[PDB]
């Protein structure tokens, strides 16, 4: 039997401002820093340790990981930063206030853009300042693999290779793994782990900064899961 711990980044500036974020590299609020430290303290007091961690290339998740590491006295473990764990790409919605958007386009249209498993937000133009092509984070990524928008389906497809190629072999090698990531990239990973239907995944929400523990059997199939706290 194995344990895997997942954690969503603490409150970001745009979470506070109610803006769609996606791949925009915004940072934690004071609250979010607090949440991350509390999560690290909660794992420390429960006796968890880790041998490796996975995160995105986005600072809100990385700083969350840093606070956890600092509270646990785990500043030295290897960390794999992967674009594959980035938040779902919000396209031309990135940066817009969610309430303003719903007023302009309607509540239903926004709920389709936010939670339709299969229908993506309107795309960035390839010339937009928000596009990923000139960002050093993505300099070794095939141009054709870089998104201009994503639905959860695309996010699931992007997350899986990192699971199959790196995280699952670590878990099988006996490494105690922590994944510090994002609301929709953790929804996507959960969807895969728990074998959740396209319909059923629509109502799953992940709070900021709360450890989510998975117990996994010999074939890495979930036995049970629970939040700590
Ligand atoms: O707001 P977040 O889950 O990237």
Cα gap 114→184, rounded to integer Å: 10
**Alpha helix positions (H), the chain:** 13-16, 30-45, 59-72, 98-105, 107-115, 152-162, 168-172, 183-193
Question: By the 8 A CB rule, do 48 and 56 touch?
Answer: no
Nearest to 8 by CA among 55, 46, 52: 55
Closest residue CA from atom 2 of ligand 1: 182
Resolution in A: 1.5
36 alpha-carbon distance from chain centroid: 14
Tell me: is residue 56 an annotated ligand-binding position.
no
Cα gap 131→154, rounded to integer Å: 17
Question: By the 8 A CB rule, do 198 and 118 touch?
Answer: yes
Question: By the 8 A CB rule, do 162 and 82 touch?
Answer: yes
Q: Is 17 a catalytic residue?
A: no
Domain positions in the chain: 1-229
**What burial class does residue 220 get, using C-beta atoms within 10 Å of its C-beta: 0-12 exposed, 13-18 middle, 19+ buried?**
middle
Q: How many residues does the chain have?
A: 229
- The set of protein residues with a Cβ atom below 6 angstroms from ligand 1 is 8-9, 12, 15, 21, 87, 182-183
- 1-229: CATH topology is Rossmann fold (3.40.50)
Nearest to 48 by CA among 92, 2, 102, 94: 2
Method: X-ray
176 Cα: distance to centroid of ligand 1 (angstroms): 24
Cα gap 53→84, rounded to integer Å: 14
């Amino acid at each position: 039997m194995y344990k895997l711990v997942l954690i969503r980044h603490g409150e970001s500036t745009w979470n506070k401002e109610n803006r769609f974020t996606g791949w925009v590299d915004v940072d934690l609020t004071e609250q979010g820093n607090r949440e991350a430290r509390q999560a690290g303290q909660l794992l420390k007091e429960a006796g968890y340790t880790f041998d490796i961690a996975y995160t995105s290339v986005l600072k809100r998740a990385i700083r969350t990981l840093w606070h956890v590491q600092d509270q646990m006295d785990l500043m030295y473990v290897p960390v794999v930063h992967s674009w594959r764990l980035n938040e779902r790409h919000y396209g031309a919605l990135s940066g817009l206030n969610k309430a303003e958007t719903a007023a302009k386009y309607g509540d239903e249209q926004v709920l389709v853009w936010r939670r339709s498993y299969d229908t993506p937000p309107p795309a960035l133009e390839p010339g937009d300042e928000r596009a990923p092509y000139a960002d050093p984070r993505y300099a070794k990524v095939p141009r054709e693999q870089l998104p201009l928008t994503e639905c959860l389906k695309d996010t699931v497809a992007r997350v899986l290779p990192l699971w199959n190629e790196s995280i699952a072999p670590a878990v099988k090698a006996g490494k105690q793994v922590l994944i510090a990531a994002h609301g929709n990239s953790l929804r996507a990973l959960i969807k895969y782990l728990d074998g959740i239907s396209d319909a059923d995944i629509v109502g799953l929400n992940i709070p900021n900064g709360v450890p989510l523990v998975y117990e996994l059997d010999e074939s890495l199939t979930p036995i049970r899961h629970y939040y700590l706290g």
